[PDB]
Design a protein around this ligand. Sequence first.
Ligand code: CU
Ligand code: CU
Ligand code: CU
Ligand code: CU
Ligand code: CU
Ligand code: CU
Ligand code: CU
Ligand code: CU
Ligand code: CU
Ligand code: CU
Ligand code: CU
Ligand code: CU
Ligand code: O
Ligand code: O
Ligand code: O
Lengths: 279, 279, 279
Amino acid sequence: TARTAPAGGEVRHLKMYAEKLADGQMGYGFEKGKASVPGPLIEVNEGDTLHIEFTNTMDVRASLHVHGLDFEISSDGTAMNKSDVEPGGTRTYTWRTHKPGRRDDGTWRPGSAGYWHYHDHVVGTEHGTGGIRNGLYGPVIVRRKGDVLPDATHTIVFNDMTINNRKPHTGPDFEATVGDRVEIVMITHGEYYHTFHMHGHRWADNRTGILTGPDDPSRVIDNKITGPADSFGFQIIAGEGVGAGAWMYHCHVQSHSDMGMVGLFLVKKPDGTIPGYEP
Amino acid sequence: TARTAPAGGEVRHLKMYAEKLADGQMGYGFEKGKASVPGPLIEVNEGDTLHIEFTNTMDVRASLHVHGLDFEISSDGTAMNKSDVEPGGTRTYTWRTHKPGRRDDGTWRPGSAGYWHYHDHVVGTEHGTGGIRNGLYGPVIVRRKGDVLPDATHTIVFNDMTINNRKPHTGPDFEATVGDRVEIVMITHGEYYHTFHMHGHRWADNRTGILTGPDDPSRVIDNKITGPADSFGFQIIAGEGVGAGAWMYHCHVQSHSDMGMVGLFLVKKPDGTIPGYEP
Amino acid sequence: TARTAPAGGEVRHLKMYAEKLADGQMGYGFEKGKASVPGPLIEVNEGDTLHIEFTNTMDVRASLHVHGLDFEISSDGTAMNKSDVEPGGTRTYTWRTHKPGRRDDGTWRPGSAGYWHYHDHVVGTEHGTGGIRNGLYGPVIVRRKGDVLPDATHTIVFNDMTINNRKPHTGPDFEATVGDRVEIVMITHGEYYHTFHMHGHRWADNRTGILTGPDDPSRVIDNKITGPADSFGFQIIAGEGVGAGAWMYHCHVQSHSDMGMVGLFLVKKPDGTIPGYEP
Ligand SMILES: [Cu+2]
Ligand SMILES: [Cu+2]
Ligand SMILES: [Cu+2]
Ligand SMILES: [Cu+2]
Ligand SMILES: [Cu+2]
Ligand SMILES: [Cu+2]
Ligand SMILES: [Cu+2]
Ligand SMILES: [Cu+2]
Ligand SMILES: [Cu+2]
Ligand SMILES: [Cu+2]
Ligand SMILES: [Cu+2]
Ligand SMILES: [Cu+2]
Ligand SMILES: [O]
Ligand SMILES: [O]
Ligand SMILES: [O]
């Protein structure tokens, strides 16, 4: 009954922009004037190739750098390799992915599938400390053939003392209906360690956050320590075994949650009601 | 020979209290005047339901909030849900648990088993920063049918710069005899990251701390980074392959151990002696 | 065709020294006057016993303490057990290791294989805060029968705000040719949490950094949070699917990389050239 990922690989083309935003932040977008923080999700299947035509519309040098995926040195997007982009410039980055498989020597090649991310490597400092602070980051998902696909995917980025660069105590909030298969991509950036926590839900601490069967010994968790550039993801069944509610998620570092690193996973009945909860 | 957990689920009733202590701290107990920090261990089998008649005996609002287990929103113990308890009041919290199994859609449902914990979510702040600092935390274990049961279970909580809210350099110490199966439940709370370390012993970094057989690829470790609200647990054979001794456990963050986050795992010969140890 | 580890255990002997260095650092060596920071790599097979004749050539007390391996209390290298070594002194430390297997009771005993380390436990403080800060640390590898052996092993230690006690922005750098099987042993020490990252390469988050086959659910990563005394290790195929290049590795905690916790993994073509780069 559950929707499943197909095999790659297709060659895919895509435009991407970096824009400085009116409030001082910086964001990526698939369309000029539609930059967001986090940047848009890129999802591919193992084997796919992605050619990203990237345009830097800003007054400063900027780049696109990615985790996990196969790229040649000319596409790591760092200053050292002159792989970043001049103001007003355009460059085509190529990301590639591969399936797992046996090497000639008999060992097993891992394969690209997982929850990754992309970000700037050049604004502010040669490690993109400025870019990253301002919002130049976004999620990437590489699916393995056979992976369980969600109804929806949300991205939660712990960037310094903010969630998704939002002001303290301003979410983001997410909504689902009891029974929705919800996917979270959880990314951390900046200076601090954090512990991501979801009330009422839990996942497996492995590649997919799901257990394929009774033989997987991965810890089942609802809390997880994370540091800069760490990424993981998982799927849950909204309100499974617990019912509808305004379920908090937050960083569990005590002063962080006290100072606003909090949001709500709003799980609704088919009638839209949530027990407790107003606003 | 090794005793294993049975199947649930029974419906179990329990009473619990929150008390302010003479010394300014706060603790939970199963009986009034027998509060402890950490609180008493709650251990159940997958499928069990637990109804906790909880009384807040303090002058401030307080709550019980649990990780991992199934509870409806009315039992999350947060202020927002009006799920906490007035001074002098009594509420019944329900914790449910479930076995893993196949969902209608063919996917695999995780199951409650693991090393979890409970704590206050309301004293001092809406995240229980005061509650937690003062001592309102305790361990929870949910067993899977077939899990290996220990001789004893000890709880070690790294709460800010303390172990079990104790003064620097005052343990706690634990005693065992060479050959004893010892379970540790290891929980972290507060502001800081820590690294838990035990001399002379090691465990698997998975759900149970134990490898089922030769196919489990989990790292075997004796050191592990933890943050606020992380919980894990494991079993070791006291002095297995290493003999009797005063084996330290400590946080390995250098200034933390220097400033007192240290205790002793006292493994004795059957005669009661420990090589190279006092007093 | 991939070279694999044999079964132990042989009884092995080894001399090791602690020396104060001209610039005020402290290091271990296998030979007096050839001390290094990190200390030299110790590699054994499961079942091997290692007798280390350790001489302290400094004016302060010092010891050798190891993680993970089997040692009796008389070889834990701590002051409390009078297991450290007086100035000019010599002591023989014994490290044993064991294969995994079935216990009498039917459970599975874990086995020593993994990425470990050794360090001083006595210089500066009873926890070796001075020793460790000055450079008294080195790696240990214990192989399981059948483990894949690399072309080379490099040791990367994040010690406080340094890599291998080096000056900010001075590497170390490592060189390989596309296709070389490169093993990293990654160790962390001191006060700080860190986040290890390699551009262009990835590994499995398990014991060996390698997936055995398609049944292993371990997250494949290129980024990893670590704390004091954490050790892990992995194997990668240099430039696998990405080609030649000056691939950065660094701590990804933004101020850390900015302030110099950066190195280069120089993957060369057979001709010696690196696209980039250049000297
Ligand atoms: Cu980088
Ligand atoms: Cu945080
Ligand atoms: Cu919670
Ligand atoms: Cu990065
Ligand atoms: Cu909470
Ligand atoms: Cu600590
Ligand atoms: Cu140790
Ligand atoms: Cu909590
Ligand atoms: Cu120690
Ligand atoms: Cu760092
Ligand atoms: Cu990177
Ligand atoms: Cu240590
Ligand atoms: O990066
Ligand atoms: O929580
Ligand atoms: O240690």
